[PDB]
């Protein structure tokens, strides 16, 4: 039984990590680097990452841009509409810690204040390969999880 539960959990991890439906909150500079990362030269669809316009059908959310006080309620609202796993990736200095507009009256110092962040991708803008490195880091985080074994031994 302990072997079967492990086989089930590794299959579920393969399914979740291979097929990541990301929703792109393309505020600012970093959205175009993501555009390039999903272009012909880097094939994210080969990796299984294919962007989905609506939050209800997306399991991973990428905050790429400067979060403003005007936008933060909309960011949280979009995040809440997502289904239960809802992993969040922070891309760029602006999203990670406010960055170059850090000491501003209208800028939120990091999307971590508004939404929980699983992976931080550093850069201004982050290189597309750096974004793929962060996505692979998230895939490893998903692979690490063994939810079904803990359900057995809960």
């Amino acid at each position: 039984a302990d072997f079967i539960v492990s086989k089930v959990d590794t299959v579920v991890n393969w399914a979740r990590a291979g097929s990541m439906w990301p929703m792109t909150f393309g505020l600012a500079c970093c959205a175009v680097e993501m555009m390039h990362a999903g272009a012909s030269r880097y094939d994210l669809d080969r990796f299984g990452i294919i962007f989905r316009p609506s939050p209800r059908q997306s399991d991973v959310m990428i905050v790429a841009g400067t979060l403003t006080n005007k936008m933060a309620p909309a960011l949280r609202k979009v995040y809440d509409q997502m289904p239960e796993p809802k992993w969040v990736v922070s891309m760029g200095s602006c999203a990670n810690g406010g960055g170059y507009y850090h000491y501003s009256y209208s800028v939120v110092r990091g999307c971590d204040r508004v939404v929980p962040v699983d992976v931080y991708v550093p850069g201004c803008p982050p290189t597309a390969e750096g974004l793929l490195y962060g996505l692979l880091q998230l895939q490893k985080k998903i692979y690490r999880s063994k939810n079904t074994q803990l359900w057995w031994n809960k």
Binding site: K86, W87, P116, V117, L150, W152
Partner: protein, 347 residues
């Protein structure tokens, strides 16, 4: 209003700042059961004021995601592998902590863990580990109002035995005893709603005679903060009942009213019958894993605790001693969550 200090020894030295997220509070807290419904709000209150919270959790990254946002950098510490039977891990968790809050409890039994383990063995071992340290200054334990040694339900009996063991080992511990807690992630209104809507029939033990005093989650979280801000509260048990006492029939009726259900779906499943329908199913639970289909409501323990009046004793400590006015759970913001579903002008 004047901010009141956290009454911890040598807090005056370490504390600095206005008391916000980025401020320094001299409280390092190990909240067991942080990812739970009660624990998350306690973590939010402690960490919101600039304090550092250590959150031991059983491996589940998605469940502990909200706790990441709770505090500033390095304030919310998430320890990956928590086991109630591992002493060394418990010592490591409370190494730097000067206050420990225990919110670990199980609504239902499984094969791996029974009531006697979680509600008795873990409190005693943790009590010994906290006692040997000496750095820990405040201990808070969260229990049900109806917990009693002479209780038919095994859950509420084991909880009282564990509370007595904690009081024995740590004499200055405070036993917080809230009523049925209402919240967005609560198991009171959410289970009642799921019963009314996605269940064929809503069984009500007896006719709903049993009286209860539900309280809002923010009120319990504030009561925890007021416990920690006063050292005179140590060694005392607080029955955090709600402002209004209601029978279960009133709550069911008012849920039906707010949701604008077509009619009354509740049925009379009197006692002495649930005690025969669920009695084998408890033994079924103790030999099978956690299953969403059946749980909590469909148990003899729930029937036994729904035939008694879970109300605060007359002479008792409560919200008034903590200078808190509890908010009504049948109106206002508390009732918004069920209100969003349907109000008869909705869908």
């Amino acid at each position: 209003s004047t901010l009141k200090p956290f009454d911890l020894n040598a807090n005056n030295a370490v504390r600095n700042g206005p008391g916000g997220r980025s401020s320094i509070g001299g409280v390092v807290a190990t909240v067991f059961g942080a990812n739970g419904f009660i624990g998350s709000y306690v973590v939010n209150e402690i960490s919101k004021r600039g304090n550092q919270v250590v959150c031991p959790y059983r491996c589940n990254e998605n469940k502990v995601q909200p706790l990441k946002q709770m505090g500033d950098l390095g304030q919310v510490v998430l320890l990956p592998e928590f086991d109630i039977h591992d002493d060394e891990y418990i010592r490591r968790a409370i190494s730097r902590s000067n206050v420990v809050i225990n919110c670990v409890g199980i609504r239902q039994e499984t094969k791996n863990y029974s009531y006697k383990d979680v509600h008795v063995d873990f409190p005693t071992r943790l009590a010994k580990i906290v006692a040997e340290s000496g750095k820990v200054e405040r201990f808070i334990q969260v229990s049900e109002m109806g917990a009693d040694v002479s209780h038919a339900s095994r859950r509420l009996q084991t909880k009282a035995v564990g509370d007595e063991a904690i009081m024995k080992y740590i004499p200055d511990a405070t036993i917080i005893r809230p009523g049925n807690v209402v919240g967005i992630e609560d198991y009171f209104y959410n289970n009642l709603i799921f019963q009314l809507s996605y269940t064929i029939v809503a069984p009500v033990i007896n006719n709903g005679a049993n009286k209860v005093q539900p309280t809002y989650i923010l009120d319990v979280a504030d009561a925890v903060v007021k416990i920690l801000k006063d050292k005179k509260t140590s060694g005392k048990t607080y029955y955090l009942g709600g402002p209004e006492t209601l029978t279960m029939r009133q709550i069911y009726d008012h849920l039906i009213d707010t949701l604008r259900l077509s009619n009354d779906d509740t049925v009379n499943l009197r006692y002495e019958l649930a005690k025969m329908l669920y009695k084998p199913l408890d033994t079924l639970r103790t030999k099978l894993p956690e299953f969403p289909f059946l749980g909590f409501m469909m148990s003899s323990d729930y029937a036994e605790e729904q035939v008694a009046d879970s109300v605060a004793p007359a002479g008792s400590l409560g919200y008034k001693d903590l200078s808190i006015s509890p908010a009504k759970v049948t109106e206002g913001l508390a009732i918004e969550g069920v209100r969003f579903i349907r109000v008869g002008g909705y869908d």
